[model samples]
Each structure stands twice: as C-alpha cells, then as structure tokens.
Target: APWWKSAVFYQVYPRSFKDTNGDGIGDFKGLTEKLDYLKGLGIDAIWINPHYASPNTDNGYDISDYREVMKEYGTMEDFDRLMAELKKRGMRLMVDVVINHSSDQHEWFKSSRASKDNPYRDYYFWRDGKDGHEPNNYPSFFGGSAWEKDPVTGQYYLHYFGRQQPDLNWDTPKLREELYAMLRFWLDKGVSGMRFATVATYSKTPGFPDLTPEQMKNFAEAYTQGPNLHRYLQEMHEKVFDHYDAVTAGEIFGAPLNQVPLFIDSRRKELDMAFTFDLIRYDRALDRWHTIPRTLADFRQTIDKVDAIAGEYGWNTFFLGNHDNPRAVSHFGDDRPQWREASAKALATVTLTQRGTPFIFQGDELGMTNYPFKTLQDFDDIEVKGFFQDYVETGKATAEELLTNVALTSRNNARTPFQWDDSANAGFTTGKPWLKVNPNYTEINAAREIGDPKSVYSFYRNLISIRHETPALSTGSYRDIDPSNADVYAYTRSQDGETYLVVVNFKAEPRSFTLPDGMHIAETLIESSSPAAPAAGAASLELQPWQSGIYKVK
Candidate 1:
C-alpha cells in the first residue's frame, strides 16, 4: 500500500490559521510554530492551500507567479523552514496546485494580451467578437459573461471563473512543457504530493459553440466533457509524476460518474484519487444557495455509492469541509449549544472509520459553527459579492431574501480566523483580522478544549490515535448495518479474524439499534456518552441523543 493509504491528512487554510506578525493574515512561520499541535492530533500529512504569489482576485487561486511565494504569506526562506520542520516531524506535505487558469497580471498573460502578433499570443484563448458582440453567451461561474474584451488587442479572452482569471491554453505544446517543468520544480523541492485544483476543466471543447436551453441548464457537464481531458492527464502523469515518489488527488467537479475511474485507475496512471461532490451537494437544489433537506438514508446511500466505486476500480478521498465550504458540524451535524460537541464527535467517527483517506479541515476539531452573518456587510467572499452585484443590485433578487441563503452557504463561514484562545481576535492576531472572527470563539476556542477529556478536540485526538493503532479500520471491508434507518447510521469493518462496529445517532433524540443476525458486541472500544459496557454477546444497544460508539464484534 502507498503511504497515503493509512495516513490522515490535515488541510491548513494558511490565511486564517495563525498570524504571528500581526499583519492580519497567517504565514509560514506561524504554521511552523504550530506543527507540534498538529502532531499532537496525529496528523500524518499537511495539505496547505495555495500560498503562491497572487493578486488576491480569487484568494490565491489566481496565480501571478507559479514559482514565487506570496509576499503576504512570507518569503521563500520561510517556506523552506516550514518544509524542513515538517520533515523533522516525520510528516509529509501536499501543495495545492492551480493549473487550469492564471491571474491576468501574470507575465505570460500580460504579453499574450499585448498584441495579436506577440510571441505569447497563443498562451491563452483569444478569439474575435462576432457581429460586434461578445464571443459567445457562456456564463462565468462567478457571474456575467465568460468573455472579457481586451482593448489593446481588440479581441475577447475566455475565463470560466472571475474575469481576472484567464483560462490557460493547454493545446499549445510549449505551454504544456512550461507547466510540466513547474510541477517538477516543486516535487524536487521535497513536496510529497499535490492537490490539483479544477483539473477536470483543463481541456476545453474546441470551437466554443453556443449552448441550447437544455445544455445551458447543465452547463458544467457540457463545459467539462472535453475530448482530450484524459489524454492531457496521461501526458501530465508521464511527464511529471512518474519521476517522483508522489501521491496526487484532483478537485475534479462536474465529471460524469462513469468517466471518473478513467482519471484514477492505477493502470491509467493519471491520478491517485479524486474528490466527489455527491455528499456535499446532496442537499442543494440548483446551486449552493438554494438548499433542501437531506435524510440519513440519503447520506448513507451517497457513502455506499462512493465505497462501491472504490471497491471496483480506484480509491476514495473523504472530506466533509474545506476552505470553500461551511463548517462540517453546522452543515451535516447539529450545531446547537446542546448538541454541538456530541454531533462533532459523531461526524468524526464516521469520517475516520470509512474505507478511504480522510481530510480534516482547519477548525473542525474544535466543532466550529457558522458565522452569525446578520447583514451583507458581514460577508467577505468574492463569490458572495459577485452574486450580490449580479442578482440583488440588478433587481433580480432582494438583499433580504438572498442574505438568508448566503448565511448558510457563503464560503466566508469557513474562512474566518481560527479560534485559538478566548482573547481579542481569538488570539489569531494582535491587529485586525482580514475577516472577522466568529464571536462564539469565546467558549469554543482550542484553549478551552485542549485539556478537557470530554471536549471535541480531545475526542478527535483519541479517535485518530485509535485509527492509527487499528489495521482493520483502514484495511477492512465496509458493510452498512441498517440502510433504511432515518436517525442512526451504523456500519462495520471486518478483516481477517478481526471486526469492529461503529454506530452514530445524528438526531437530538434517543434511538435504539439492534445488531444483525449472527453478530454480537464483545467489548466497547469508545463511546460519546457514558453508557455501561454491554455484556458479552449483547445483541442490541440504546443510544442517547447525538451519541456515537465503537465496539469490537464477535
């Protein structure tokens, strides 16, 4: 098995993690100082979001220079020190790589837009307008048309995301070579792996034709289903990944289910695994803002589908929260004052016991909740501002109605400064933070939970330790105990003469669960609530509200 098979990954959103210099943003020095904290939590690897040089148009996703560190994030020396410290602790590093697009301020883009006859003119997609109108009616993921006209060249350029982010031209042979070399530059610097961002949209369909009404309804699928996506991935693997001992995962949204395995099968040599959005998007109606209710059965079916796909051909990467999503406890668990801690523990149990590599987002161990955003001024995400301008300001929607959904779905909910201690700015910085810190940090900060045995932080640390010690938890086959349960999720992991059972109650009421035929609990491993250990050969258990338990089966 690869090193990542049994390793646990921790994602660090650097800007909100810690601010040692009081600049209202986190840097590499602060991260290096807190490695012992992560080591205490039993993290095997660290996946840091983009820290490269950028103009902050899209929060570091729009890269101005691929080889340089962001000034706000610190100098290259600071990054080197951070890497050395991680190596000293026997931990690996995975960097977030954004290759689908680059900031318009990049030298390549600057030259490409200088004139039609520039040597780098083909580095990006530049097309002529038709009938004095924009190239096509394609919509940007942020808002408005995807085409941005350049006054210097009298042509329009394509951008799937923000206008400041121009899509790269992968068909150019010279450009592909430049990207492959840049990838090797980081791998040679001792980085263990990479998390490729927006990888499915790298190869676009030629001609850029207009879409019909039906195709427009499902624009993401139509845009991402390119002819040369696999070929480009295979070429990248051969050119960059084959030479190093590296593990790769892709942020591949909008790809069809049947085509997913083509990107991750070891025989295909494209990527190690890919993140699936089914579990995250299960409750959304059309987009993240328009939400719907989800049941426990819906959650179980999504996980089962992912497990089945991994069992067939490839691997799975499990994650409940990231920099772009809301807090895990608030999204999937009960985040009320009475149920927050227990529900956080319950969700952690599910994430770690599944048959996949689990990723713990920053602040999740503290059972963080969503920000109490009362007005539009409380938000700071680029996407939220774009939506507000496109819909509210344009009179397509009202601020009062849209603010309700934004509170539940905005990315800023996860981007707030991390709660370290009950102090001004949550001890994240002495100066003002780039984004406001959540007010609930007074009672939910890490300092409050570090030593308490019943705290959410302690539960996560203990569960990670248990997973590290149990081979069956990582290598066993997964089986759902009750597929139709609405309030309880139960599953089992079994391998050569060893079996473990995990059960979690997701609601705020008591629930009862019975073991399947021929199964019995031999001993209690862990429990969220103080329940008596079942006698040998016990066939049933009663659970408290938001309770979770692990048991050895006989």
Candidate 2:
C-alpha cells in the first residue's frame, strides 16, 4: 500500500493560515513556525494550496509563473526552508498543481495572443468568431460567456473558469512536455506528491460544439467528459509519475462512479485516487447558489455509492471540507453555540474511522464556523463577485436573495483567517487580514480549545491517535449497520479478525440504536459522552444529541 493509504492529511490555505511579516497574508515563514503545532496535532502529511506566482485573478489559481513562488507567499528560499522544516519534523508535503489553465497574464498566454503565427499560439485554444459573435455558446463556470474576444487578433479564447484563467491546449505535444517538466521541478524539491486541480477538464471537446438548452444547464458535464481526458492522464502518469514513487490525486468534479476506475485503476497508472463532488452536490439544486435540502439518508447513500465504486477499483479519499467549500461543521454539522463542539467531534469520529485517507482542513479541528457575511463587499472570492454581477446587476435576482445564498455557500466561508487566539485579529496577524476574521474567533480559536480535554481540538487529536494505532481503521472493509436509520449513522469496520463499531447521531436530539445479532460492545475506544462501555450482553445504546462513539466489538 502507498504511504498515503494510512496517512492523515491536513490542508493549509497558506493565505489564511498565518502571517509573520504583519503584511496580513500568510507566507512560508509563518507556516514554518507552525510545523510543531501541526506535528503535535498528529497529521502525517500536509497538502498546501497553490503558492505560485499569480496575478491573484482567482486567488492564486490563475498562475503566471510555474517556476517562481508568489511574492505574497515568500521567496523561493523561504519555500525551501519550509520544506526542510517539514522534513525535520517527519511530515510529508503535497503541493497543489493547476494545469488545466493558466493566468491570462502568463508569458505563454501573452505570447500566444501576440500573433497567430507565434510559436506559443498553439499552446492555448483560440478560434475565429462565427458571424460577429462568440464561436460557441459555452457558458463560463464562473458565469458569463466562456469565450473572450481579443481585439488585436479578432479571435476568441476559451476559458472554462474565469476569463482570466484561459484553458490550456493539452493536445499540443510541446505544451504537455512543458507541464511534465514543471511537475518534475517540484518532485525534485522533495515534495511527496501533488493534488491535481480540475484535471478532468484538461482535454476539451475537439470541436467547440453548440450546447443544447439542457446541456447548457449542466455545462460542466459536457466539458468534463472530453474524449482525450483519459489519454492525457495516462500520458501524464507515464511521463511524470512513473519516474517517481509519488502518489497522485485528481480533483475530478462531477465524475460518475462508473468512470472513476478509468482514472484510478492501479493497472492504468493514471492516478492513485480522485475526489468526487457527489457529497458536495447532494444539497445543490441547479447550482451551489440555488440550494435544495438534504437528509441524513442522502448523505449515507452518497458515501456508500462512492465506497462501492472506489473500493472495487482503486481507493477512496474521505473529506468534507476544503479550500473551495464551507466549513465542515457549518455545512454538515450543527454550528450553534450549544452543539458546536459536540457536532464537530461527531464529524471527526466518522471521518477518521472511515476506510480511507482522511483530510482535515485548517481550523476545522477547532470547530470553525462560517462567517456572517452581510453584504457583497464582505466577500473577496471571484466566483461570488461574478455571480453578483450576473444575477443581481442584471435584475435576475435581488441583492437580498443573492446575499442569502452567498452566506450559505460562498467559498469565503472557508477562506477566513485562521483563529489562533482571542487577541486582536484573532492573532492571525498584527495588520488587517486580506479577508475578514470571523467574529466568533474569540470563542472558537485554537488557543482556547487546545488546553481543554473536551474541546473539539482535543477530540480530533484523540481520534487521530486512535487511527494511527489501529490498522483496521485504515484498511478494514466497511459495512453499513443500519441503512434505514434517518437520525443516526451506524457502521462497522472489520479486518484480520479485528472489528470495530462506529455510531454517530446526526440530529440535535437523542437517538437509540440497537446492536446487530452476534455483535456486542467489548471495549469502548472513544466516546463523546465519556461514559462507561455497555455490559457484555448489552443489545442497544442510547446516544445523546450529536454524540459519537467507537468500540471494539465481539
């Protein structure tokens, strides 16, 4: 098995993690200072978001230079020092790599657009207009037309995301070579692996075909399922990954269960694992903004589907929070004052005991909640700003309506600065943060929780310790204990004669769960209520609101 199979990974959004220079932005120096804290938290690896040179068009996703570090992040020397510190602490590093697109300000894009005959012109997609209009009706993922007209060359470029992020031409052999070399540059720097960004959308449809009304509604599917996607992935593996012992995971949004094996099957040598958006889209109606209600059954079914598919082919990655989503406690668990800590622990219980590599987002262990964003000015995410102009400015929706959705689903909910303490600015920096600090930081900061044994931070630490000590939690076969239970989630893990039961209450009220025949709690491993284990022949357990428990079963 790969090292990642048993390792717990933590994600750090560098810009919001910590700041040492009082410049209101986190850099390598600040992250280096926190290595001891992370090591103490028991994470085996760290996955940092992109810190490459960029124009900040999409908050570092749009890269202008692959070789240079972003000035805001730190100099290349600072990055090297950070990596060395991580190594000294026996922790691995995984970098975020964006290859589907590059910032429009990149030298390649600048040269490509200078002239049709330029050598770099073939590196990106450019097409002539059709009858004084965009070549096609493709809508940008960030809202508005995907095609951007260039006045100098009278041609339009394709961008699946923001216009500032133009899609790269993977079909160009020279372009693919350049990307592989850039990946090698990072691997040589002693990084363990990489998390590929939007890798499923690398190869676009050969012809920029016009979308039907139905296809236009779900445009992501049309572009994400390109014919040459798998070919390019396999080529990437052969050229870059095969030479190193590094693990690779792809950000494959909207991919169906059946199609997952094409990317992660061990024989294919494409990717070690991939992330699915099924759980993320469970409550989404037409989009993230337009929401739909989801029940506990919906969440279970989504997880079971992914487990069934991925378990049959490759592996799984268990995560509920990331740089692009809302806080886990706010999104999946109750975030109110009374139940926040309990619910955060309950979430941690399920995530850590699952049979996969678990990823903990920064500040999630401290029970971070979403910010109470009031107006549009409170957000700095490009996606939120784009939707406001398209939906509110055009009168398609009122400002109040947009603000309501933004409060619930904006990426800014997860981009707030890390709450280290109750000091001014939550002790994240001496200066004003790029994004507003959550006002609840005073009550939910890491400093406040680390000292309390019953705190969310301590709960996470305990769960991680249990996972590292028990091999069954990492490689066991998962079985659903009661699929019909709506208020509680019950499951079991079994491996090599070792079996454990994990039960969590998803509601705000108490719930009763019965043990299956021929199974009984033998020893309590961990419990949210911190109570004694049941007797030898106990048949059932009554759980408190948002309570969780793990026990060795006989």
Candidate 3:
C-alpha cells in the first residue's frame, strides 16, 4: 500500500506543542521528547507547522530563511537529532513549506526592495500605482489593500497576507526554480513530505484588476487556482517531487471543488492530497462578527462532493481541526462538559472512516475545545487583529459584540498551548507559556485521559487503530444513508468481504432511525450506551444524544 494512503498524520503547532528548558516556548527538542507519546496514538506521520527562521509576524508562517531553524525553537543540531529519532522509529516527518512568499526581512526580499535596478527585484511582484492611487482594489486575506508601497523604490509590492509576507513572483522562471531548489533541499534532508502553504494562490491572473463594489468580497477568487496552477504543479513534480517517494499536499485556498481530481490523480502527479475549506469556512455570516450554527447537511455536501471522485483515482484528505482553524470539538460538536467527549467521538466516527486520509490536530485526542478569550488583547493572530480593526473599531460593529463572536471564531482558538496535564501551564512548560493555557485544561488533559479506557484519548486511539486494521475504512466506498437527516448521520463502507455501517447522533437528544436495507449490527464496535441498540434484524434503531455507533454488518 502507498504510505500516503495508509499514514495517519498528526499536526504539531510547535509553539503550542511542548516546551523544554523552561523557555516558555515549544522547541525542536520538546517535539523530539514526545515521539513516543505520538506513536502511542498510532500516528504514522507528523506534519509539523512552520518552525523555520521567521520574524514571527505570523508565528513562523512568515519565513525569513527556508533552510535555517528558528533560534528560539532550537539549533541545527536539535533538528538533526529530531530527524535521527524519527528515522529510528520509522516515523515520517512532513514539514510545512511556505513558499508562496518570503518574509520582507529575508535576504531576497530585502534586495528586491532595496533599489529599482536590483537584479533580485523580479523575484517579487512590484507594480506602480495608478494616478497616485493604489493599482487595484484587491483586499488582503487579513484586511486592507493587498499591495504595500515600498518607500525606497516608490513601487507597490504585492503581499496577499501581511505586509511582511511579500508575495513571490511565480511568473518568473528563476523564482520558481528557487522554490523548487528549496523543496529538493528538504527532501535531501530526509523529510518525508511537503505541506505546501497557500499553494493554490501561486498563480494570479494577469493585469491586476480592481474589483467592483457589486462583486463578492472574497479576494481569493480573483487569484487562487488560476489557469497556470496545474502547469506549475506539474513543473514542480517533474523537477523535484518525481525522484522521491514524497507525499506532497497543499493548503489550497479557495477550496478547489471539481478540481480535486486534477490535483491528486495518481497519474496527474500534482499532489498526493489537498485540504478543502468547505466545512470550516462556511459558518461565517458576512464576517466573524455574526455567525450561525452549521448543520450536518452543510458538512455532508462537502463530503459528498469530494467522495464523488475519491474512488475514481482521486485522493483526498479530511480534517475538522488544524493549527489555523478553531478547535474541532467546539466548532462541529458540543464542547460542554456534559457531552464533549461523546460529541468528539461521534465526529471522529463520521470522518475517520470515510475513504480518505484523516488528520488530527495536536490536542484533539484529549477533546480540546476553544480558548475562552474575553477581550481583543487575547488574540495574537494577524488575521484576527486585522479583522478586529477593520470591522470592530470602525463603528461597523461594537467591541462587546464582535468580541463575543471572535472568541468562538478566532484562529487563536487552536493556538493555545497544548494541555499535557493538569499541572502548571498544563504541563506544557514549567515557566510561563508564550500564550496562556486554556482555563479548561485541568479537567481535559492527556495525563487524565492516557491510561483511562473511558477517556477521549482512548476513543481516538481506537478510531485510529480501526482505520489501520480495516481495509474498508481506508479504501472502501462511501455513501450517505439519509441525505436529509438533520440530527443523525449514517454511512457505510465496504470492501472485499467486509462491510461496516456507521451511525451518529450529532446532538443532545435521542433520535430514531431505521438501518439501511440489508444492513444489521453485526457487532458493537464503539459506542456509549444511552439508547440501547435494538434486536439485530430490527429495521428501527434509536441513537442516544451525542452517540456514535460503528457496526459490522452481516
């Protein structure tokens, strides 16, 4: 089997994972010490977020050097030790590659902006203004204009994110070659794979044009997944990726829908898999200031759309949580004390068994929820801060109102230091953590869940183990049982001679349903008894609140 198809990846937000030497920040050595812990969870690979040398404008996403370690995280020797340890355990390391842009402080960006005559100027996008006004009305992903003027050169430089993150000119052949070279460097260092950041936006349409007031405000539509994206990907594949067994995936912006097959078809040689934003990015109403609850129907559409091609030579990945997204349990399921564990397990049941590689965030095993941030000061995300200033401070929204909304929706919701135990700083660090520990960490922690069979951690381990043991869980066909069901979600996976049915009650009330025709509960795989299962052949079954049942069908 292909490693990419079978591997279970755990995402590590380095600054929030673990800390050593009481530095108040997580480091490479800290990650090295936790390999055993990750392995215990049955994780075959770890996709570590950017820990490269950066100015921390966006917490290491703004990379200054592609090949150097951030001094605060550790030294080159520490990274060497990490590689050696991963090799010893036969575990793979997937590094986040932020090649879309470089920090303005990077040597290339510095030279690009130093003078109009600089040879490196072509490495980045630079344009002149129209009649002293900005060239285009393209908004940044964070907020404000996407272009920033360089005082020395008097030309606007494009930065689709923060000003410090100047977008690279992928139109330049030399620039693409530079990024390809960096990809080769990491592969040569024994890194198992690359998680390309902002990859779909690498190619922008020609003639930077302003958006009309009547047009939708999503800036990504104007630039992401452009006509040349596939060409560039194929170029990269031939130049750097084809020689090795590297798993290449991308944090594709704009959420490629029909194009999923183009990116991941084994014959296409573009990417192994890519993440879609349909599930997480849909709940917002205009802005983060106002939001509404998302139903299971909202998620099923995305899942079904992806599943349509998954069995037809297309590969996809699934996740509800990640470093930049809010915590999984809180966003999609209940995080209240009464139903937190059950709801988390229920969600895992629905997604993990789908025909795709599943990824779990760092603290997801312990059912971590959102951080209780009461004020704007609690957020450190560049996007959050920018949105707050753009919408909240300008009389567009009241501070109290958006603050309430932002708490449930902030990216920092997932950035809180991981809760290892109920000790000081949740045992993430002996000294003060760079970020405050979540107040709920005491009751929900790894130390409490690890040895207990009833804990959420154990539930996660069982879920992972099932995927490894059941070939149907990894490569079977996926079909929704009841497309219109609002509260309960049921699906089935079958391959070879084994068929497994999954039923999930995604709420706090009991719901009754009939098993799909020809399906019966052969065994109780994983469930919490609230509403007891009916007789094996009975058409009718009841699911308890926050309950999930995986059944083997005869």
Candidate 4:
C-alpha cells in the first residue's frame, strides 16, 4: 500500500503549475512550495510531467538527458527535495519517461550527427536517403515528413514530433541497457512510478511508403503495435517496472485493444495500467471543428469495452482532462448560467462511479472550462505552431482559413494557467503565468467553488471519496440500466448481491427512470447540477437537468 497499488494519482504539470521564482516561468522550487496544498487535498500520489533536461520543444517531452534535471525548472537538489516532501506526507511521485524520443541537442544525437563514421551514429535511427532525396514520404506526426535533413551531414534523422526532437533508435541493444540504467538510478532515488509518454507508436515501420488517401489519415496506425513492440515493453518491464515494484502507466495512444492484455498480464506484469485515450478518440480526426462524436452511446460503448476487457485482468485509469486535452467543463458543460453545473456533474458522475481508480487533472475538481484565447499570439503549444507552418509551407488554405482551424483544433485549448483564486494571476503566480489565465477565473476560482457546499468542486471531492472508500462501487460489475435513453445515463452496479443504481440526466429537461426494486433503498451520495441526495422510497426516480444519483440498496 506504500506508493505501489490501491492509490489514486493526481498529475501536476510543473511548468504551468506554479511560479515561485517570479521569473515568468514555473520552477521545481515553485512546485516544492505547494506540497502542503496537495496533501491538504488528500492526494496520495503525484505524477510530475517531465522536468528532465530538454530544449522545451514539446514542453519537456523531448528529453536531452535521461539522468539530469533541466536548468529552467531548477537543480537536481530541488527535485530531491520535492520527493522528500511528498514522502513526508505519505505521498509518492511519478516522472515522465520520454524514452520514445530525445532532443536533437542531446549529446548522443550530437555525436551521432557529427558524422556517419562516428561510433555513436548507430545510437540513433539515422539513414541514407533513397534516390538521393530527403528520405521517403514518411510524414512527421505534427503535420509534415517525419525525417529532418541534417545540413552538415547529407543524411536524414527521424522525428515523431518537431525536427528538434529526434526519434531514438530502440533497435540498439546499447540503448536498451542505457535506458534501463537511467530508470534504475531513479527508482533507487525513491521515485514512485512512471508515466511512459508516446508508447507503442513512435517507432516507424523500418521502411517508408507513400500512403494513399484513406490510409493517409492514420499512417501511424498501420504499424503502432509493430511486430516487436510487445517484446520491447516486456524487456522494459523486466528491467524497470519489476525493479521498482511501482505503478506504471503507458501512453498507449494507438496500441491495439486486443493486444493490451499482453501488457497488463498480472503474471508477467509489463504495465500497471495503460493510458488509453478512450474518450479522446470520440473525434474522427484531430480537427476538432470538423470532429463531432456521433452520440453519448458511442462514448459509453468505449467505456463499456474498456471495463469489460481490462477490468477482467487489472484496474484502469479514468480521466477526461489532461495537459493535452481541453477542460472537461468546456468540452461537456454549458458556458453560460443556463447549463454549466449540470454538464460538469453528469461527466463527473459518469467517470467517478466507474470500476477503476480515477486520475484527476489539476483544476478538474473545480469544474474548470476551456481556454478563451483571443489571438494566435496567446498560444504556446507546438502543435498549434506546426499547423500554422503546414499551411504556410503548403497552400492548403489561406492565412485566415488555417487560423480558424488552429483556433478550433489547437492543443492550446488545454494549456491555460490553472485558476487558484480570484486574483490578478488567478493566484498562480505573482508575475505573468507561462500561459494566459482563463478570463472567467474571477468567478470560477477554487476558493469560491470549494466554499460553496453545492458547488461541483464539493461534489467531486465526495465522488472521489466514494470511489476510494466503497468497495462495492469500485469493483462492481456494470450493467446498463436504460441503454436506449439518450437523455438519461442509468446503470446498475452489483457485487456479491449488493446492488446500486446510478442515474444521471444529461439534458436540461427532467426525466424519469424506473429503478429495479430495492435498488434505491440505500441513499444518494452526490448530484452535480441539480442534486437529489438523501432520497428514499421512489419507484420512478425523477432527475432534473444534469442530476446524478448514487444509491446503496439493501
């Protein structure tokens, strides 16, 4: 129970989390000062997004050194203190493991790029171009060719993201040993677990081909679970995951669902959990404006499948917001008074009352909404910049045309500063935050919401408590109550004949659900928008807009 299993995690984005240095950027020291606040919230574990040495190309996802902390965040001593403080409060920490790629400025890549004859050249996935051109048409994940031509050496190197972040050559045995050593060094230092970034998809097909139209959209999908990925994962698990006996969550974006069991085998134990983008996959393509999830059923089916499969083997992690996603409130709630709380509660109820340990992103408990960015200048996500570059390089559309797409689809929607209070900087920093604070923070800060008993923040805390304390709720088998009801989400959860009914109204209009006898005998725990707590004796349950009911029946 000490930082390994049965503990929920809260992910903290270090750069934008706090600013103790007053230098317009957050530092590790800033995060160290906030340990008490985290402990006060009852979070037992913290997942620190990468603070490793990097050029900040992808916000530290592109690592320069596997062993060193970056100067911008602070010293390695600061990180050590961060771990010590978390341990004092009985909390554990997880750092991002960005083994998929390294920054082009990294020493290994520098030596590799120095010359083809350099001994370190094989350490990376460098190759000679066919037909003496800038490699074959392997497009970069962000929107262009994945290969970047080195001016000094006439060869090309692969970059899953920007040209600055080059892909690592995992095929090398030396690389595997080096990666394992770095992981062991951290595990020895009391680091709790890892959030493996970009798992199962970075490595190319080992050969490139000009993809046709239908396949052009998801080229990476073709070879994500490529022949040897599972073997590679098992090797990592044997060395790193087994060594720490810590929780491991892989960012398995495009990994095959059927193959997930191989990674989660309780016997071999390759991964503790896989961070499947179950909800994020609602969109057909990356373009959000053009993207519309067909229906709530489509979303429910994904959750059902995840539960039906992974829940059979091991636990799964649930979330709707993160560094890469728009806030849950904005995505699912009403922006106006007409319907904000209901939407937030409906989403919260659906996620929290499920059969797994849920991971809450910072500000999610407060019903935080999406970024209200006015101009492209206000954005910082590299994916946004890359979209603009694509439009500029290729005449896909005009400047204004592309900017519209960027506004609608940019990763910038999720990168806004967290709103802590109704102050100048939302109590995030004394100086300017790394990103602009949401303009509506004045009314939606944590101080005001947590103070109100009926606020979504209060309800979320209760939901988390229930998910943590109630064994029947966490491990129960799920059955859809009224799968045909589009406006209502009703489900039955049972374990050892102890049954509970969960009902929520997704629409503004009230709806009635006829519960299975004795199912409503227990009581109500939480209601989001229009709550109905401490209720009894109802054959047909009437639910107001965004109403949530959790009942314990005898």
- What is candidate 1's lDDT per residue for 404-480, written digit by digit as tens? 88888788889999899999999999999998999999989988989798899999999999988887787678899
lDDT of 4 by residue, 150-194 (tens): 887888988877888888878888988888898898888988788
Q: For residues 109-214, could you state the per-residue lDDT of candidate 2 as single tens digits?
A: 9999999999999899999888788999998878788999999798999998999999999999999999999999999998897999988899888888899999
Among residues 3 or more apart in sequence or in different chains, the pairs in candidate 1 whose N, CA or C atoms overlap within 3 Å are none
Which pairs of residues collide in candidate 4?
Answer: 139-146, 140-144, 140-145, 140-146, 522-552
TM-score of each: 0.98, 0.98, 0.97, 0.94
> What tens digits encode model 3's per-residue C-alpha lDDT throughout 226-280?
6788899899999999898889887777745766677778788888887777666
lDDT of each prediction vs. the true structure? 0.88, 0.89, 0.83, 0.74
Error of 2 at 438 (Å): 0.9
RMSD of each: 1.2, 1.1, 1.6, 2.3
What's model 2's overall lDDT?
0.89
